[PDB]
Point group: C6
Amino acid sequence: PIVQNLQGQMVHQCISPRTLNAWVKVVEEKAFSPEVIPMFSALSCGATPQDLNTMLNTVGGHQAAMQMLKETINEEAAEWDRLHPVHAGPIAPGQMREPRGSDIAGTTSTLQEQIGWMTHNPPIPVGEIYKRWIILGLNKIVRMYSPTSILDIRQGPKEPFRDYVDRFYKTLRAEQASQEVKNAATETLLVQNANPDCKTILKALGPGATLEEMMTACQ
Amino acid sequence: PIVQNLQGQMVHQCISPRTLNAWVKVVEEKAFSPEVIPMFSALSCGATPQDLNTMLNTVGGHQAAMQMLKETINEEAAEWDRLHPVHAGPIAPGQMREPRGSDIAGTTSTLQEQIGWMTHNPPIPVGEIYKRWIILGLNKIVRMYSPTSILDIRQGPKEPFRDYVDRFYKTLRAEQASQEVKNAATETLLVQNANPDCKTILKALGPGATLEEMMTACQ
Amino acid sequence: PIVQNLQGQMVHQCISPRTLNAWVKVVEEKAFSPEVIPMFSALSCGATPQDLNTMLNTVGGHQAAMQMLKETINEEAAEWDRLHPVHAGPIAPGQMREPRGSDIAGTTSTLQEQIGWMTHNPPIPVGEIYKRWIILGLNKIVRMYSPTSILDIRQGPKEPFRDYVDRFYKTLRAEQASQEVKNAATETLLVQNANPDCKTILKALGPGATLEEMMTACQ
Amino acid sequence: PIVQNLQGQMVHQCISPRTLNAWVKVVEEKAFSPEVIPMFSALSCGATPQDLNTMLNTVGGHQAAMQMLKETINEEAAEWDRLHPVHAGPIAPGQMREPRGSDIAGTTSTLQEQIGWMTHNPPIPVGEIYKRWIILGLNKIVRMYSPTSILDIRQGPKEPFRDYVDRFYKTLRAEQASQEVKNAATETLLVQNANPDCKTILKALGPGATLEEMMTACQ
Amino acid sequence: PIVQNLQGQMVHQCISPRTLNAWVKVVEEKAFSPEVIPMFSALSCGATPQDLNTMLNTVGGHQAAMQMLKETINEEAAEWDRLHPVHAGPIAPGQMREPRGSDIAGTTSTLQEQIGWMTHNPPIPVGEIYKRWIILGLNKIVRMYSPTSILDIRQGPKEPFRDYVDRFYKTLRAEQASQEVKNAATETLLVQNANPDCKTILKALGPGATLEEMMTACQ
Amino acid sequence: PIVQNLQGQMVHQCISPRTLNAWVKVVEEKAFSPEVIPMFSALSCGATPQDLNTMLNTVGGHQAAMQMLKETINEEAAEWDRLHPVHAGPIAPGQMREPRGSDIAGTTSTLQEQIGWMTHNPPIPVGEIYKRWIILGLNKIVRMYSPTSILDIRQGPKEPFRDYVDRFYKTLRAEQASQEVKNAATETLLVQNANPDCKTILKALGPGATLEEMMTACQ
Ligand SMILES: CN(C(=O)[C@H](Cc1cc(F)cc(F)c1)NC(=O)Cc1c[nH]c2ccc(O)cc12)c1ccc2scnc2c1
Ligand SMILES: CN(C(=O)[C@H](Cc1cc(F)cc(F)c1)NC(=O)Cc1c[nH]c2ccc(O)cc12)c1ccc2scnc2c1
Ligand SMILES: CN(C(=O)[C@H](Cc1cc(F)cc(F)c1)NC(=O)Cc1c[nH]c2ccc(O)cc12)c1ccc2scnc2c1
Ligand SMILES: CN(C(=O)[C@H](Cc1cc(F)cc(F)c1)NC(=O)Cc1c[nH]c2ccc(O)cc12)c1ccc2scnc2c1
Ligand SMILES: CN(C(=O)[C@H](Cc1cc(F)cc(F)c1)NC(=O)Cc1c[nH]c2ccc(O)cc12)c1ccc2scnc2c1
Ligand SMILES: CN(C(=O)[C@H](Cc1cc(F)cc(F)c1)NC(=O)Cc1c[nH]c2ccc(O)cc12)c1ccc2scnc2c1
């Protein structure tokens, strides 16, 4: 990654064994549960493209997912190239060249080039641009590997309401509900999918109840 | 987080793998036992809003609780906006803009903006403001998930007094008793809820006994 | 805590995850065995009052003990206030104010205030003052939770002398014997509580024997 | 390794116990799965030839592989020597000498020499050159130890498509398919090797389907 | 401990959780096996008297041993006082005072005093002096807890010679043989205590055989 | 060890708990497998003689080996003294004295002396000299504890060739074959010791086959 040192300057540091191990372990334990994405983001703080590729390459399993991620990256890189075509022909001696999509993804750029872009004034934040593409791909994979529709999350007759709500919002997270549903699912589907006894109580609360109020009512 | 370096200056540092792992593990092990809150507070020392969101987002389960926390945050952010309305229209070039509630919660602000607010002279401590909202929400969740009323903590006939007192004050902590009860429960309910033999002894101690004195008397 | 940096200056640093985890684990494993106190002391090196409260608050169980500790703190804080009354009325702008007992215990003071006191020339060492109160309380709890009188530590007929002496001095430590007994128990109770065969040998050694000499004699 | 310090200068640092342990453990756990290579690369960031030899020498098992790796190194070192012959006869006093292949591999050079080459302006990056030879050898070993032809990865009649695709691309990775196959295997062999029911569906998708589309179709 | 910082100056640093944990664990696992002493010495690098007391106080069991160690310390402190009596009467304002034995052992000195002695030019190395007393005491305890005489280490008829020699020198280490025996036991008791078959072979080697030669001969 | 700090200067640092633990664990797990030597070398980067003795002394078992190592050290120290006799009689005040063999081994020198030698311009690298003696001794022990002759490593009739080659080169490593055999054993004994079926195939490959080619042929 690129870090600031103790005297305020941006320099390259090796990825730590701790970081490497943390990432491998989170993939091993959590697969593509939604919470893997914020963990990736955090563990890739300051990452170069080379570092991001390192992280992805350390994943041993989940190769269907890793191929989908490559496809996503290739699409974003192609879009980059449409928006930001570079002049061809030899680079001015000693001067920074313009990154193409493949350079952002670290396939056709050196570490030295990546460092140069990321620490330029003003910077071309190739680490952050690539990380965005990766996260886009990861979110697609999370959605793919989500096993259950929100339509199929219904409170059992002997299921505590809190347990149901846990399942409901964990499923919405994976399914990657748009903000309206996340926000309002409370008013709609959460009540509809409750068991008959809790549904009766929730209906009687009337509109605008907080989740705290609902959970209290159905305790 | 924002830390001071070795030469006395405030700069941004990535959240460490150790910090990330510690938080996930404490939620995994302790759920919303009251002691999770001081651990959150400690692990989020110097945190930006982005860091706080990272921490919250790394939680995989407990999604009912995480939705209640969002609701709490939204309420505090709305109150912020009522107390501190911002001027609309384009920002003066190069100048710090005023944070709205959504900016404090990290949904509409960049890391660079957050750093700028937190390190301004004087600072707008958006990390600490957001952390307060989060802790407010966490305390509500602790109360919610507390399973037992203090009224139902009564000393068994074969239960050592110390074991009872442990249960009593652990329950009061979760229930989030006001200071009077925490302070005085000793004089009131703790004695009332003791078993007959210990109650007889405690009654005979008369008023103002310390907890040490009570525990000695009922050993 | 407040630490010196690499250039010799006293600044605030966040409590580390390692420190936090070490403390929780020592309480989990050792409860209020006497050796918990030196571990607390060591793990709270340089601690502010805020840090000390963090450490105490991270304890999930042992709430009878934690309430006794609060009582101890309240007594010491009240004594502080009797010895060091503060002038009331508004503080001189920009100037350090005088700490009350509640400020030392971190209930009515900010982190910024605590830092200011601890790093003043000359300092008001509020961390060390509070730590002393806490340790006083912890020692009371160690004594309380000590299960066995020294009077009841007697060498079994088939018990190796070393095993007995281990039990004896572990019990004296918890019971918190005054220096005379720690020093001289060797000459008195240790011999009296030995089994008949070892007692006969120890009696014949005559006065002033070292513990090494006693242990050799009864091997 | 050679690292930059806190003031921006390139100096030698000992290989850490953490790095050493991470490498041994990855070989112990993963043998020569393809993901071992990016882990080697990452753990050898900034490595001298001496460090690289340390890493390789810490491997206790897999001695057939380690002998193949030596053979690969010897071939690359011989090629180096053909491309970059050195002048014989005594070195100018005090001056940097030119590295031979054996010097790059760390068999005939000192640590001091390696440091001198790697930190020269301009550098002779002997660590990176040697690392390339090692990675070439490691890739040969990965291919060797790959147990299964891609021709033999066929979807079972009761095997979820995702599970099949996982096996397929994990095998292609080890077999070290050229870019065309990695890229296009999707259009060819992946469909051919699918079970009859999924094959029927995939055929009907027509050309140019993304892997995401295929996986959705065969869910 | 007192350490040098990054700019070459001697300052106080808190004892780390890692150091604390390492020491407790070595006592837990190894008791008073001889190898505990070098581990103590290493973990107490740069220690103040306060740090050394911390380390000793963190030991929960082995209280017979810890009381013997106190006795040893008291003897060394008394000898210190006989060799280095201090002038009584009030200290010159602002000036370093002379340490007594109790000050070296950390019972009557502050951390500030200890730091002052250890960093004086020239220093009064109270940490190293106390550590020597402790190590003297620890060595006595190692000898005490050594269960077996070297006279009783004899090679079994079916025992490999190497296994016997392992037992022999492990016992000599604990028994704390003087240099002559350590050096020459090879020529004497090691042969005498070998089984008849190996003894016959060793006798025929004649004088001055290395241990390597003996072990080869009896393989 | 002696390390460079963050400003480029050579100073003494305590051996870390991590280093100590890593070494003990590698001896516990691996005994005197050949791979222990590179691990020793790596963990003793920058070590003083005092540090090296610390490392060796922390080993609890394997005392036959540790006595052989002492013997090796004594021989090398005696040779040092024959090659580099020192002038007797009192040292010039304030001046560096010349190390004898016992000083290099850390038995008759202080830490301060060792630091002085190692950081002199030009240095007398007593750490590296002693480490060489230790490694010489360790290699002798590895050879000693190697249980099996290369003559006895023969491919089983149902043993995969790769498994055989693993055993073969692991045995050669321990036996510490000279370079010719390591290099050429491939052409000779490896084929001779193969099972009849693989031997037939290898014979037909003719001379100069790589190990990769052999392993492919016998798959
Ligand atoms: C520069 N770069 C890389 O080193 C990527 C990084 C990467 C990207 C990703 F999206 C998923 C990953 F698991 C690993 N790694 C690989 O190509 C290695 C590999 C993994 N599984 C594989 C399965 C089959 C196979 O024949 C190779 C691989 C790279 C980076 C981005 C893209 S987009 C298309 N190709 C690339 C290549
Ligand atoms: C900027 N920001 C965030 O990245 C929050 C941070 C956060 C806040 C919180 F209160 C609880 C959490 F678990 C996570 N994270 C998420 O929205 C992701 C998520 C978790 N569970 C979910 C369940 C369903 C779903 O469709 C999304 C999520 C954010 C931060 C504060 C608020 S208040 C209303 N929305 C937001 C969004
Ligand atoms: C500022 N301050 C604190 O944050 C203390 C720190 C503390 C002190 C202590 F002695 C024991 C502890 F476990 C925790 N923490 C708590 O009050 C929280 C708590 C723990 N168990 C509880 C059981 C019941 C309950 O309703 C609250 C708590 C604080 C600090 C000192 C004193 S003395 C009287 N009250 C205070 C409060
Ligand atoms: C300088 N250098 C080294 O210290 C190499 C480093 C190395 C290289 C490698 F390709 C694989 C490894 F496991 C270890 N280590 C060894 O030779 C020790 C060894 C391991 N297994 C062995 C099996 C048999 C044997 O008689 C020795 C070894 C070295 C480095 C490169 C080459 S190429 C030909 N010889 C060398 C020697
Ligand atoms: C300043 N100082 C200390 O804090 C020593 C340090 C120490 C020294 C030692 F030799 C063994 C230890 F386990 C702990 N710790 C204790 O006295 C506490 C204690 C442990 N087991 C005990 C058993 C019974 C008891 O009533 C107290 C203790 C101290 C230090 C040196 C000496 S010599 C005589 N008394 C002292 C006291
Ligand atoms: C300065 N120095 C040391 O502290 C050595 C370091 C050392 C050297 C070594 F080759 C093997 C080791 F396990 C430990 N340690 C010991 O002597 C302690 C010891 C271990 N096992 C023993 C078995 C019996 C015994 O009566 C003592 C020991 C030292 C260092 C080098 C030599 S050569 C001859 N004597 C020495 C002494």
